[PDB]
C-alpha cells in the first residue's frame, strides 16, 4: 500500500431502481442473522421484471482503482427463470485493455456450507483515464463500493499464528 481506501462508485440508492437490490443470503450472516457482502450488490427484477443493463464508469479521482464483480451460477433453473427470466446468460465486462464475456448455465454441485449454488468472482485493476463498462442479461454481482488506491512497493504478506 502507498494509498488505499474505500469509496462508493455506485450507491445502492439510485443506481438500480429498475432491479430489486435488497436480497441477501443466510450463510452470509452476522451474529446469526443473514447478510451479504458490504461492497457489492445482488440485482433481481421488479416483481419478476428483469430489464437488461448497460452501465459504466471512468475515473475522475486520478488515482488507481480496484474493482470486483461476480457471475451467477444457480444450482437449479427455477431460480434462473424466476429471477432473471432468461435461460441465456450473457454478460460483457469491458475495458480498453481487459475485456471478457460470461455465458454460464446451471451446474449442480454438492452442498458446501449448505450451498450447491455458486457465484464465480472476477476482478481487475482500472487506471486513471480508462473506462469500465458492464453489460448484462442478469446473473451478476455488481459493485456498491470500490477500492481507491495508489500503488505501494515492497511490503507484502505473512501467514502467522504468533
Amino acid at each position, epitope marked *: 500500500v502507498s494509498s488505499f481506501e474505500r469509496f462508493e462508485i455506485f450507491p445502492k440508492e439510485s443506481s438500480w431502481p429498475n432491479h430489486t437490490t435488497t436480497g441477501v*443470503s*443466510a450463510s452470509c450472516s452476522h451474529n*446469526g442473522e443473514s447478510s451479504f457482502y458490504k461492497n457489492l450488490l445482488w440485482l433481481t427484477g421488479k416483481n*419478476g421484471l428483469y430489464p437488461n443493463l448497460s452501465k459504466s464508469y471512468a475515473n475522475n479521482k486520478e488515482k488507481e482503482v480496484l474493482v470486483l464483480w461476480g457471475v451467477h451460477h444457480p444450482p437449479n433453473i427455477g431460480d434462473q427463470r424466476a429471477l432473471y427470466h432468461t435461460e441465456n446468460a450473457y454478460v460483457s465486462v469491458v475495458s480498453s485493455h481487459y475485456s471478457r464475456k460470461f455465458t454460464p448455465e446451471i451446474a449442480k454441485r454438492p452442498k458446501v456450507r449448505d*450451498r450447491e*449454488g455458486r457465484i464465480n468472482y472476477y476482478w481487475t485493476l482500472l487506471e486513471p483515464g480508462d473506462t469500465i463498462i458492464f453489460e448484462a442479461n442478469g446473473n451478476l454481482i455488481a459493485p456498491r463500493y470500490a477500492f481507491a488506491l495508489s500503488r505501494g512497493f515492497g511490503s507484502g504478506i505473512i501467514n502467522s499464528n504468533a
Partner: single-chain antibody
Framework: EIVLTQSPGTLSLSPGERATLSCRAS???????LTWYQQKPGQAPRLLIY???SRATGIPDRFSGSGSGTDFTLTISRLEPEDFAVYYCQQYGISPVITFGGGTNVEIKGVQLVESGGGLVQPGGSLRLSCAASGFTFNIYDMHWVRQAPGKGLEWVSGLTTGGDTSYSGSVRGRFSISRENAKNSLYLQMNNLRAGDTAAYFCVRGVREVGATGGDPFYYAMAVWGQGTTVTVSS
C-alpha cells in the same frame, strides 16, 4: 403501502358456476406482486394463486385469474360447496409492507409452525408471544406476524427480513417489538401498551426465500406457509 379494495366481500352463488373477484388498488402496481388465498373459518389459510395468473402446488385447475396494473383479478371456473370460504388478496409493497384485502366470502347456495401464548391481558398491559418451527430451516425465510378480527378484514401487523430491515405499520410500531432466533428455530414478539384494537386472532407466517440456499424449495413473492394462529385479547 397502498390501500386495496376487494370486489365483493361476500357473494352467494350456485354450483356449476364461475366466480369473478376483482382486487384493485389505489396505484398501478406491476403484477408478480400479489398472491391469493382461501380460508375456512376454523382452519388456517391455504395458498392458491400468485402474480395474477399462476397457480400453486397441490391443486385442481379451476381457480384462474387475470388483470394487471391497478386492477388485479382472480376468477373461478367452477363453484362447489367444498369451496365455502373467505378468499384473500395479499401484496408485497415495494415499501416492504404486506397489504391485505378484506376477505371475500363465497357462500354456496343449495413442515409446520406452532404458536405460543395466546390469551388475555388487561388493556394498557404487556404480554409476549412466541412461535416455534418444525422440519425446515428458519434461517432462510422472511417472516411475518399478521392479525385478523372475527369475520373482518385482516391487518398486517409486522414482518422482518432475515438481514434486519423491519417493517411495521405506523400505528402499531413501537408498541410491538420482535426478535428472531435461527439457531433456536423460533421467533418472539414482545408487546406492550395494548388496547382493544389488538383484540383479535393473530398468525405467525413464513414468507420469502431471501436469495440463496440449497433446496428443492423454489420461491415466489407469495407466502410460503401459515400457522394455525391464536386468540389474543384485552379485557377487565
Amino acid at each position: 403501502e397502498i390501500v386495496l379494495t376487494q370486489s365483493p366481500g361476500t357473494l352467494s352463488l350456485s354450483p356449476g358456476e364461475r366466480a369473478t373477484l376483482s382486487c384493485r388498488a389505489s396505484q398501478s402496481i406491476s403484477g408478480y406482486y400479489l398472491t391469493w388465498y382461501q380460508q375456512k373459518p376454523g382452519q388456517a389459510p391455504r395458498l392458491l394463486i400468485y402474480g395474477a395468473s399462476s397457480r400453486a402446488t397441490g391443486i385442481p385447475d379451476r381457480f384462474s385469474g387475470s388483470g394487471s396494473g391497478t386492477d388485479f383479478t382472480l376468477t373461478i371456473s367452477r363453484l362447489e360447496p367444498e369451496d365455502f370460504a373467505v378468499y384473500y388478496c395479499q401484496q408485497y409493497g415495494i415499501s416492504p409492507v404486506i397489504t391485505f384485502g378484506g376477505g371475500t366470502n363465497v357462500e354456496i347456495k343449495g413442515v409446520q409452525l406452532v404458536e405460543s401464548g395466546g390469551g388475555l391481558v388487561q388493556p394498557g398491559g404487556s404480554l409476549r408471544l412466541s412461535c416455534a418451527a418444525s422440519g425446515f430451516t428458519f434461517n432462510i425465510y422472511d417472516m411475518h406476524w399478521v392479525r385478523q378480527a372475527p369475520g373482518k378484514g385482516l391487518e398486517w401487523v409486522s414482518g422482518l427480513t432475515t438481514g434486519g430491515d423491519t417493517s411495521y405499520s405506523g400505528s402499531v410500531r413501537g408498541r410491538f417489538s420482535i426478535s428472531r432466533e435461527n439457531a433456536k428455530n423460533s421467533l418472539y414478539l414482545q408487546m406492550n401498551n395494548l388496547r382493544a384494537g389488538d383484540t383479535a386472532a393473530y398468525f405467525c407466517v413464513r414468507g420469502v426465500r431471501e436469495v440463496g440456499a440449497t433446496g428443492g424449495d423454489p420461491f415466489y413473492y407469495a407466502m410460503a406457509v401459515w400457522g394455525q394462529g391464536t386468540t389474543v385479547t384485552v379485557s377487565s
